[model samples]
Target: MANLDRSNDKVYENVTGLVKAVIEMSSKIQPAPPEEYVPMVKEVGLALRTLLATVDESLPVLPASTHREIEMAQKLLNSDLAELINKMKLAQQYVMTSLQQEYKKQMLTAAHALAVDAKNLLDVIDQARLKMISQSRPH
Candidate 1:
């Protein structure tokens, strides 16, 4: 048997929840009016900001590889943020004039990418947990 760090586990759980909530919010976007879609897009942005804060706070406690993965995850979220800003600009265009419908598809695609990146980061945390457990067990 191995001693488990329940504190680290709880942090991971929180991180996972944040990621999933952001995904659930963003994944529902459709090619509709700005009011129908923009709120969730902003919500996802706020959630990612929270995730970045969590990663910063947990950096000292995380394993090295997990830390690296989280850094990349932060980068991914930042990238998504940039994309989201552009999406909003395009959304405004759509509202003012009937622009191409492609922006809606792009928005959905970016959301999916963020979801995948978040899941991959979660996998890194899971790997860290397994490693910690393995190291704690008696050889």
Candidate 2:
């Protein structure tokens, strides 16, 4: 197996933080006439997907449970993020016009669930990274 490269650690860390912020902000997003938050969600979603794709390629090189944890985290993140993006798209579809109150309510609820999912995934990633880092150090 190839050695895991830590060269991209800074990029991964930044992306992780960005994903967390996006998930948190998305959960409370309220659709408006000007359509402010939807664009932000879309942009953040795309950036996060790309970031995950880049980082995911290196996960297999990690030792033991680190790779496993990251794989699970990637799955959770991709699935929930896809769902959130779809929901956001649906919400955006009606943003410039009359949006049903119930639909908006449902979208927000779904967003919150996705946010929770992202948070859990990020926690696993963080834990696994710390575990690997600590293990690499000479005791």
Candidate 3:
């Protein structure tokens, strides 16, 4: 559908902007005190959740080849989206219970990994967008 491409592009644009902010927010998670980064983690972790929702919602109407790539990227990202929730709770648990260094540290490492994952997903998404553009030219 022409409407599908237009709709898909809207998703891509939203995803791109959100991913930029997601990576930046995640990057702000330093090895500081619990109060400093916990809120940031919760904020971005939920943001990541919405990111998954928007991207996946776009999937039902996608083309086969690039759909496969989005599938692959989501698979990689899905596992760590799990981790985001796990570490999100763990990080908060740390804050509430005892400020356990390990949980916070785990979040720190996990946060960096997510940015790289976001980076890879962005690359794949861009390639797919370019492919879409390529095929739309005059015959």
Number of clashing residue pairs in every model? 0, 0, 0
How do the residues 1-139 of candidate 3 rate in per-residue lDDT, one tens digit apiece? Answer: 1334565665665555545655565555444445765666555556556766777766643433567777688767666767776776667656666656656567557656766776677577666655655676332
Give candidate 1's whole-model lDDT. Answer: 0.64
Best candidate, TM-score? 1
Off by over 4 Å in 3: 1-42, 56-64, 96-101
* TM-score of each predicted structure versus truth: 0.71, 0.62, 0.62
Query: lDDT of all predictions, in order shown?
Result: 0.64, 0.60, 0.61
User: Which one wins on lDDT?
Assistant: 1
State residue 82's C-alpha deviation in candidate 3, in Å.
Answer: 1.4
Question: lDDT by residue for model 1 over 110-139, one digit each (tens)?
Answer: 667766776676667777756655676442
Deviation (Å) of 41 in candidate 1: 1.1
lDDT of 2 at 6: 70
The better candidate by TM-score, 1 or 3, is: 1
Cα lDDT of model 2 by residue, 60-80, tens digit: 433356666666766776676
